[PDB]
């Protein structure tokens, strides 16, 4: 179908959210550009409000919201009375609205308005306005635009089908939200007349809305989100009406809602009334706060609802009071004390498993407990009554600890925190072992990190407040729960596809019994490693050990005998997960003791783990070993079936594997499988015939390597467990200050974790340990092992090649910028190259954090306590950059080169976390790094730029001052290439390190960056252009940019040339006017001169952009202005300075071959002082001017002759280079695209009506011609922009991939926006215009042949005024006016020159119907592509801005226009044709489709049918191909067949013919005779 039908149908079948939301923005954009198509888009999304699917109704209601926002508000300068509403009659006599099964077919087939007129009679009865229950056998721009629509919605509010009532309520919500004020008004009345007419209409809707709250009994028990889907929604619609009605109408709605709550019960009427009151306080809280009578009644309603039996009534009641919980506490402290215990009463009846709706009750209690006033009034009631003591109330919060909503579980821990920080007299009846167990259970099973943090923070205060009383009391309350809680802290963790479930009987409910929108903690209690991340289970054992470690540090040691037996037993457990957790509990116990000697009884069991050998198997890794046996067996079974080997020679594998329970010492192990692939694969290969081996060995080698894959997979899995347990035991020893005599094995255990540990929390613990171990050694001599540890950390922070280059690999590179290589090289993908690179990133991550923690432990004493660090960072730079570079530093075999690289690698690794007292040491090294930026070796310049950028981001005062004073001023220097490459590179890495923090410092960066895009070195141009693109992306468009804090006041003074640039770049309306210095013959409009200001701004700062002005605004003139002015201005400065950058060079204008004459004509008209060469013609003609093109000011060239003669055109240098329809360059691989990019030009422009289509790669190719590096190379552009965009558009894409693809669209549009000048023709009388085209060779031949015969008699019959003489002259003019359109109109069989013409067409090898002989056909496709109509899915393609009418006089011409232009040339255009041949009945059909479906681009028709009174509205442009002798007969048929917008009228006229002469003349004999002369 059409675009609009396919675009709307996506609302139903949008597979992802991104695909559905993209369709609603297309419809919203379609309304924004074509505001008159409002009721064509709405009449297709409104039917989707009755859809049987929930999301389709939601999406369709969303589109109505977006489409209506793009409609102008309506200011024109049978109703219901809200007061006369009786609650008793409607509830009693009304129609209960239920889930609707019945469908009455007799009504369904009625006229859509007769169906509506019938439902408006039945409505008064169904509402109960009669004294009886109504039964359906009694009855078997002048005004508001949406008033006809709202009748269908207000009537469908009571349809038996609950799906229809759902969509009708959402539709009314979106219409009244944007357009609520104008409803009801009618043109022809004063403000006071339709202000109350609006009040009556809004009261009429509120009347109907309250009825739905009373009558709707529908309830969906399936989902826990919404219980009353219609009452929840129709109350949301009531909120949109409240923000538009008077204060008196609100107080009337308030009383009617008050009767529904305090019914003077019934669940539905009480709930629906509360829902309405919920939005009254959330929308009109201002009006509610003066009238104290409303404040009392709305609070009386909440309190009754808060004590109601049903849970859903208490939820909406609590959600009503939250927005004014602060406001109600202050104003009425008398009612404050009664509100507290009623809220507390609501939580008392609840069990442990709470519905998702009950979460709003907790939100109400949490906001009340955040006020000190409420906390005091509770203590007064606690000292007075026993039933309000904290022992009976607080445990009512425990069922909320494991609530389904994530935000509720955090609000409870924050609330329970408030009670622990309240009093000692107050909070001890509830603070016991019962709450300690629930919190410890919360630590094991909580998945959210913020909630797990508060659980540990509450566990600390709960333990410390209870240990302050007596350490024996704390140990008694927890002794009853200590035994099972230990089994959960030491519980093993499984492998993906091998979950180790926890015993659910070890979890006590708040009810007291054990476990034996639900299943909140079952995924983790089951231990699903795939469903919940492997790192989430690990950080739940870490949190367990940290909790269990703190509680043990307070219990007296003699009563910890049961705890030690559990952990000593766990150190020898067959589960590696348990041994790791066991050693971590000992660690956190020794950390929290006052002295480390208290825990010194664990020294011997832990030193066993370090010194003894590790077990060769673990029970948690049994799945890996079982997987190894399968591969080993299939490898052997293949040695039997595929290769013919006897069963007796085959080895036998054990059926049970090691680590399994009840596994003998002869079970299957990894060592057995290593013997199968290493020694039995060889032994069994000797037992094959040399003929059998040749056929079977292919598939055997494949089976062998698949086995080794799993073998090395299991061995790596076990060695990871050996390192985890050894490192955890060593860290606990370091906590007990265990400094061995021979510390090599202790240090190795901690180091092996820092090298290889995928998990960050386990690695960060080992980094913090090795940082304290360095401090413990330097605090007691032992500088031997202390300086070897720090030296390894420094070595490990340089292994990631992405951060620290390998010097011998790049040692030979000079005059190269490695920053460009690093990104143009990572776009390599091999499994064993990405695994080794992953190990390097892990090793650096650990070592970097160890030095970070080391720098914070020693503070400002880091360089005095650890003097080896100062040597690594300072010594190599002093040797190499104090004076001349030693020749040793250039050799890749010498280690000196890498020592210099590592030195600067450590500086940027530790500068951020360095104590501010060590910044002078870094500043001492700055003169050495600047010396490296100037170096000739590129790898030194690369690291110097990364290092300096980091230093400037930390020491923002002196670091920036050094860069602006010592580096930036010498980017101009044309003698030292190496310093320029280094200085632009430190700018590149400065923007990358700081990010959007670079904003205040962009002042100092902008001029060196801009000027470097105009540099002789190609690499500096590219990296400066990429830098400039990142700046445009990172600026705040709407806000200003502050000044650099703390810098010199004299640095910011002389930099005002750089502030006017940034101001003009953000806002294009602040561009300085440009007085054209050449004598141009033109009246420049407000926008034309404004557009020339934009082109001069680009020329001034060496920028390039696209001129996207809509057709008619005159893009050709604005370009001739700027190129004539530029040639003049650079003719003056070349006379002043003679610099090569302003030498005389010709400009180049590339256009489609049809527009070659159009440019040549308008330069002749507006700028007659510019000499023009037209390098277009036959290959023979082009070769004369081929060698002489620089001898003029402008050179015009077609895209076709630019490919064949590119070797000629690139031999020249060009000033300007304009592309008249530049979208032909969008193909990056096209030959025309590559030829245009081989040109050396100074200033570039692109002229298009459409800048981009659906693809983003089209946009890259255009911007790659303008500013080469602006979007990067093609491969780096396909990565950051094209890959995520294409992935989010996948039918089944991830929710992360959707936002990754949406952030890229938004970022790509921001980089390219300041370089596209897109001014609409309409927003900021119909315009006639002439489109000129040139005659063809055949037309000139046929005109000359006519005047040779007929021209003799034309002189006779010209001024006769005779009878048949005026008939001969007229039909002689008809022959010419037909020939001006197409030669095929006049060259028909029977003509005297037919046989001669066919010879001419044959000698040149063409046909008569060839479109090149009728230039009006070619001029029509160019006029259509300049209006965005024709281009060379409805979803991703943009909305076309115009629709056209195309008029012709003859039916034969329309066939050419149809079969040639719209079928061969522009096949993507949707069109309809209208002839007098078509039936007068069928022609009315397609005229309707043109006004009902706005996706018809063009309507072809002849001027005969246009005068038939048919009226069209969607037309925006009108084109005339053929013309009548009376030029107003064309004006009649146009207006007769046709306002808000402006209409563009185009006359296609061949220059030099009678068309240019007839249309000019507004008859004398000699003036008639001149119609037969060309020119």
Residue numbers in the entry: 2 to 78, 108 to 170, 308 to 431, 438 to 689, 728 to 1038, 1041 to 1537, 1543 to 1650, 1656 to 1761, ...
Excerpt from the publication:
The single subunit remodeler Mot1 (Modifier of transcription 1) is a Swi2/Snf2 enzyme that either activates or represses transcription in a context-dependent manner by dissociating TATA box-binding protein (TBP) and Negative Cofactor 2 (NC2) from promoter DNA. The N-terminal domain (Mot1NTD) recognizes TBP while the C-terminal domain (Mot1CTD) contains the catalytic Swi2/Snf2 ATPase that binds the DNA upstream from the TATA box. Swi2/Snf2 ATPases are members of the NTP-dependent helicase/translocase superfamily 2 (SF2) and are well known as the principal ATP hydrolyzing ‘engines’ of chromatin remodelers that govern processes such as transcription, replication, and DNA repair. Mot1 is an essential Swi2/Snf2 enzyme in yeast and the Mot1-TBP-NC2 regulatory axis is highly conserved in eukaryotes.
We determined the structure of this construct (residues 1–1836, Mot1∆C) harboring a point mutation in the Walker B motif (E1434Q) by Se-SAD to 3.2 Å. The construct covers the entire Mot1NTD and Mot1CTD domains but lacks 50 amino acids from the C-terminus. The CtMot1 enzyme is a ring-shaped protein. It forms a ring-like structure in which the substrate-interacting HEAT repeat ‘arch’ binds both lobes of the ATPase domain from opposing sites. Lobe 1 of the CtMot1CTD contacts the C-terminus of CtMot1NTD via HR16, a small insertion within HR12, and a ~ 45 amino acids linker. The tip of subdomain 1B interacts with HR1, thus lobe 1 effectively closes the ring structure of CtMot1. Lobe 2 binds the cleft between lobe 1 and HR1/2. Indeed, comparison of CtMot1CTD to other SF2 enzymes shows that lobe 2 is flipped ~180° from an ‘active’ conformation in which the ATPase and DNA-binding motifs would be properly aligned, that is lobe 1’s motifs I-III are properly situated in the ATP-binding cleft, while lobe 2’s motifs IV-VI are situated on the outside and are fully solvent-exposed. Although the precise orientation of lobe 2 might be additionally determined by the bridge element that is missing in the structure, our structural data suggest that the auto-inhibited resting state of CtMot1 is stabilized by the interactions between subdomain 2A and HR1/2. The bridge was almost entirely omitted from our crystallization construct and the only included residues (1822 –1836) together with the C-terminal expression tag are not visible in the electron density maps.
